Here is the input.
Amino acid sequence: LNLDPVQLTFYAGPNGSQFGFSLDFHKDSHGRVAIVVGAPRTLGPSQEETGGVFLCPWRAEGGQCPSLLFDLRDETRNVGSQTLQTFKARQGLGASVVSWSDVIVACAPWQHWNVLEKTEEAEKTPVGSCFLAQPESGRRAEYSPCRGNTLSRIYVENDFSWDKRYCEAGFSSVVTQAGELVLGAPGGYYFLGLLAQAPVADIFSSYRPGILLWHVSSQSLSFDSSNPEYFDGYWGYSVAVGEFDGDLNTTEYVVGAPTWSWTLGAVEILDSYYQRLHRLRGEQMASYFGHSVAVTDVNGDGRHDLLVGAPLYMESRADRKLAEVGRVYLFLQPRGPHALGAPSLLLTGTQLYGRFGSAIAPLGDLDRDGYNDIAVAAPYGGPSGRGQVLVFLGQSEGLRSRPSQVLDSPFPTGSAFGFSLRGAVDIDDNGYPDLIVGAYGANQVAVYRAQP
Amino acid sequence: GPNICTTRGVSSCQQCLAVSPMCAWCSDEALPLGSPRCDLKENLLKDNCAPESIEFPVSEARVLEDRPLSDKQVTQVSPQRIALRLRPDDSKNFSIQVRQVEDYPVDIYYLMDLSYSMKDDLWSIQNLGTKLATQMRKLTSNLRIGFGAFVDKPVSPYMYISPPEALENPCYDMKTTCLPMFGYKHVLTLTDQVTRFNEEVKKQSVSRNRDAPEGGFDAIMQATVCDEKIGWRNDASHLLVFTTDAKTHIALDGRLAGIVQPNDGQCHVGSDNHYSASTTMDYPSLGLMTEKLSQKNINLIFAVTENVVNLYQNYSELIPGTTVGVLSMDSSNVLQLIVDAYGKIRSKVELEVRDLPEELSLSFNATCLNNEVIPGLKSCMGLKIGDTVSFSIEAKVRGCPQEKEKSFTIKPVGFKDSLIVQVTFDCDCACQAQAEPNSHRCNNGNGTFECGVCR
Amino acid sequence: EVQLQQSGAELVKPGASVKLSCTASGFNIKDTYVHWVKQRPEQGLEWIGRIDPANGYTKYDPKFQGKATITADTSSNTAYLQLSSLTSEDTAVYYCVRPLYDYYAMDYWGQGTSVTVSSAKTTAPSVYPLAPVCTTGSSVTLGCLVKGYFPEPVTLTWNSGSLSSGVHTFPAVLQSDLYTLSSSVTVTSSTWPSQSITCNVAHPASSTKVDKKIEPRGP
Amino acid sequence: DILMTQSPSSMSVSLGDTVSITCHASQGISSNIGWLQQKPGKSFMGLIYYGTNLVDGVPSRFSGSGSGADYSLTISSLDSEDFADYYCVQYAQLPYTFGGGTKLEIKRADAAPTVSIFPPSSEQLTSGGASVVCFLNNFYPKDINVKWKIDGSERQNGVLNSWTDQDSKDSTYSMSSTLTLTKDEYERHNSYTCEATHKTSTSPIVKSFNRNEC
Ligand SMILES: *[C@@H]1O[C@H](CO)[C@@H](O[C@@H]2O[C@H](CO)[C@@H](O[C@@H]3O[C@H](CO[C@H]4O[C@H](CO[C@H]5O[C@H](CO)[C@@H](O)[C@H](O)[C@@H]5O)[C@@H](O)[C@H](O[C@H]5O[C@H](CO)[C@@H](O)[C@H](O)[C@@H]5O)[C@@H]4O)[C@@H](O)[C@H](O[C@H]4O[C@H](CO)[C@@H](O)[C@H](O)[C@@H]4O)[C@@H]3O)[C@H](O)[C@H]2NC(C)=O)[C@H](O)[C@H]1NC(C)=O
Ligand SMILES: *[C@@H]1O[C@H](CO)[C@@H](O[C@@H]2O[C@H](CO)[C@@H](O[C@@H]3O[C@H](CO[C@H]4O[C@H](CO)[C@@H](O)[C@H](O)[C@@H]4O)[C@@H](O)[C@H](O[C@H]4O[C@H](CO)[C@@H](O)[C@H](O)[C@@H]4O)[C@@H]3O)[C@H](O)[C@H]2NC(C)=O)[C@H](O)[C@H]1NC(C)=O
Ligand SMILES: *[C@@H]1O[C@H](CO)[C@@H](O)[C@H](O)[C@H]1NC(C)=O
Ligand SMILES: *[C@@H]1O[C@H](CO)[C@@H](O)[C@H](O)[C@H]1NC(C)=O
Ligand SMILES: *[C@@H]1O[C@H](CO)[C@@H](O)[C@H](O)[C@H]1NC(C)=O
Ligand SMILES: C[As](C)(=O)[O-]
Ligand SMILES: [Ca+2]
Ligand SMILES: [Ca+2]
Ligand SMILES: [Ca+2]
Ligand SMILES: [Ca+2]
Ligand SMILES: [Ca+2]
Ligand SMILES: [Ca+2]
Ligand SMILES: [Mg+2]
Here is the structure.
């Protein structure tokens, strides 16, 4: 209702860096909020694309940011009569960034990996990897749960089971309040997709530089399947967490599988052992139902609701004609031991090719009326196609169909304004939560502040 | 009481004909002076004018060239040449028949999935392509056919990128050889050279990539929007036949190769015939595919193997107008769709007049398939091959032109055939040939005694 | 707490086989490679091989290819070593090992399993008192000789464990397939023979417990 | 296979010392080396992995170093618990191979042995065998040589020898030597001699007895 559109703050990265592809609020030990920005096409120190992360301190004037430095040197280890190799070129460091306590986790989903052994190899493949940083100490750690030392032939001999070579770990990511890092790896198990979880503390304590293949004993990975419904489902394209089984002691995970069951798409609510609690099926093929997932209590009953985005949903129109506009599905959580039902509300975009529902951000209580609110992105929406972010306030009945406020892109065409969003954090300490929007095409991030 | 012929000067037989078509002239010297020479033919005969001495030209139309309409040179218009002979201010009518004999123009562009899963289906797509070419040629002599191939976006993880040998030979780890991977290759532009098309299709061999879903939608988009490369004709039926034995990539899949830029819906197949945006641009969405197919007036046919028919039948419902046929060792299923598509084609006969003189003006009556003479109309619609329409044309000359011999053409739009109408303007009388320059009967310095009169 | 719990000591016959076990405690055996290592007093540490219990795949030093078969069972969280065609060279202590973090490392070790390959029968020790020869100094040293016993161990004490200080019980040594051991005790001359010093040998296997009082040698 | 040569095989050192054990590989192993500790009669504990990384719980006084084919383990300010055996292992290549071992030993002043000869007991002589026992006790350093003579002639076969570990109290070593021969031959000779040679003296310590002399 009251994000200020006139008094924006622009943070900028280098040209062609995709500064703003991903972002999050990060809070230091003192409590001072900053903004972590991922820039997955940033040139490294040798003029080759590696990606990078920037840690922006809060300023009204905005501007340039300092780089959160990470090791961009390739590694080679000759051990156990094998040769391990990491390849950081075009790895897309900062394709996802997430913050937790005093830690920042930035991932490079397309970091490649190979293992040579005489004339054979595992194959040079994008296992992905996450770089963990604790800025106030300087400590660095990595996590790359899909690396293996199994050779090419053995996979063939076992019908490509448990094949983690193409995981792209860190494609999506989220952290629980306790400090469990959960990564989406949609290329997992020969493109079915998997999730990998491990405590942040245990990632840090088990990592040493140069080892490349190490054990994180507390880690837990999801499972391979022979159910054709899961084939090419990209299970883990998006990931989120919340409370969906009533037991406050346990944490539930929400996984997006946008191409699940022959491109029908699906989102799953799972326990922390990766057992399915519920499955939400997509409405229309190729709509990418599961591209985005968001969890927040919007109707004020204290039960987390679920929001799923299908940005390529084609809407019906006069004379049997379809129109790609995007759609978002609201699922309110009922009382007792009951599953989630049909959508309580369908929010459909209006601009052709707008990709409404490409990003869904919980805003917290933007106007302090008692109900939590959300922001939905249409990165190519608005009359001109420059992009749009629509604010929806919560109420007892769920959400309003009509947005409370529309944010038009201040950047030129192709910025992808809204492709990434984040809220629920008061960056200027005025008591109201604020919204940060990324425009990777324009190499920038816009900060909208909330007012009385 | 009196008529226009008698009461309008009328000194000469020539002026008599110029007054009106209904006028006749008496040349008979036996006629008394009381009787007028320029009158109606009934009045002259009633006044004892010699029947042979009456000058009264009648306008006519003679068929000069009249070859019959063709069955199944190719004659579509009939007759081909008429000779019109008109007198001052007079009109004559004539008939014309038009028939759609020649076959309708159809374009068929063929997209070949040459990924490794198609090794065992390679014969099937080769057989389908060559049977399409051969059988549709029997169905229409105005067929043009061409093809392209696709695999997927040549980038990790879709592409095998190790060991280095694998780039030129993706089948390296299998101890065999196959072609390098590629996005979309345009191979043969739409051509009527059927024997050549069949030869090239049989030369095609497979490549190899990693993931089951392929990049055929890139090929569909480029085959639709690259007008000059594929060679789609303006006034022709456009069919895009798509083959595959597997799932397909769709918009937003590109992110697994690090590709986030949405499909711009534009042609990116340059001089080397490869889709240059393959590795930098995302797969097209269904809606964008639908938009361009509709804009370029192209019908998509999914010729897919049985294991994925239901998958493509479901996509088909989201791209209205698309149809699905089963790719197999037998080509009958897919061929019917094309034949059925050809069955629905209709044409029109729209007459256009070229080189009509200022003096001549035309009026038409159209008799179409409904067998109703719609007057003033000069075009019929809704014809199939073999149908025949019919028009009655009337031409009226303004007075007597000094040119005396002109010609114009009546031609159907789109048809090479035409009716050439040669017009002659008969303004003189037959007795003017027998002029007799010397006066004889005048003797006042007048001169010339024609059709029984002095100056 | 990561801990590898190995099976107990083995006494086996030449030409036979034996199968040692290594059970994971406080972790799952499929978590990492599990290695098997051999130790002998003279020859030192030799690496036998490894297994990846997740999938069963193994590697062996060519020296032990044919003799050693490593297996593992994730249902019982246990890894195994089987040695066929036992010889005297297989008499050694056997350890199972796994890494802490580094895939390839050798960080956590089991407590070891002792294997003794022998044809010997259970034979009770002969115990002999060793009194000094016929000057006498300020101190006197006595002894006890334990001969011709199998298998190990024996427990030797003086005065039923009362006399512990100034004692030297030497490690057993093999001769002709039976073990021999000795012990010496030194005391002041004023103590012996005035006070009774007896040798106490026990051999659990043969169910024997012998006492030998050290008497001075007479004329 | 990669040969790991460890040096020294033993060293005699004191509490509070700083010592280094070296390990030389037959080829480069780029830090793919571990260091292990085995305390007397106990099993193994990992100290260092990948060249320099201390295993969880290992005291900071242990450190690793080196590169290529040459590596060192340094213990700073020796604790009494640090007197044990130490081994390097390489895992650059299969088969994994170990160094020979290094034994840390408590340094003390040199001490001569107390040699004591013992004739066969009466019980043994009735049984039909005859063993002459000789204890060489509480000496330092551990190296010692024993020689048997029967009537002045060196006897070699049928001698069994055993050494205790370094004593927990006085840090000395002891040895037992048993000459077993047939009772028949034993009763054919008068003089039986046990000669200890040790660095503490140039001439040996000789202990004898004449059979049946009281
Ligand atoms: C395209 O098709 C049309 C339709 O067939 C065709 O039209 C004819 O055109 C010619 C000239 O080109 C017309 O000829 C003229 O006829 C005039 C008299 O017409 C009257 O009489 C007709 C016959 O009446 C009887 O029979 C009919 C049916 O059998 C019946 O219904 C009646 O009750 C009656 O019993 C009659 O058909 C005609 O009706 C049409 O016209 C009226 C008036 O406009 C209209 O209201 C009606 O709805 C109907 O369309 C009408 O009642 C005649 O006077 C005239 O003669 C004068 O001019 C000529 C020169 O042009 C001189 O030579 C002469 O001296 C006179 O001055 C002339 O003969 C003919 O009547 C048309 N027929 C019809 C049905 O409309 C076109 O020719 C076709 N074009 C081509 C290129 O093929
Ligand atoms: C292409 O598109 C078609 C049409 O959409 C898909 O076929 C449908 O697949 C859906 C799966 O979502 C099927 O849904 C199931 O319907 C069953 C009831 O259908 C009855 O009636 C049909 C008449 O058409 C009969 O054919 C059928 O035998 C039945 O008698 C339900 O029993 C199912 O319920 C179960 O699953 C759902 C979740 O999916 C749960 O909510 C339920 O509790 C229960 O467990 C289910 O609703 C549907 O039957 C199919 N329709 C047709 C016409 O066949 C294809 O799958 C799709 N193919 C591809 C490749 O994309
Ligand atoms: C980015 O490129 C534009 C031209 O397209 C140029 O104006 C500008 O200098 C570049 N940005 C920066 C920060 O240099
Ligand atoms: C919550 O579950 C965990 C995991 O099993 C268990 O260890 C713990 O006891 C539970 N905590 C409470 C407060 O019930
Ligand atoms: C032309 O029209 C006249 C009307 O007088 C009619 O007699 C004749 O049949 C028509 N001829 C043709 C060829 O259409
Ligand atoms: C993905 As393939 C085996 O058809 O190249
Ligand atoms: Ca819970
Ligand atoms: Ca709620
Ligand atoms: Ca609110
Ligand atoms: Ca604020
Ligand atoms: Ca196939
Ligand atoms: Ca593919
Ligand atoms: Mg294929």
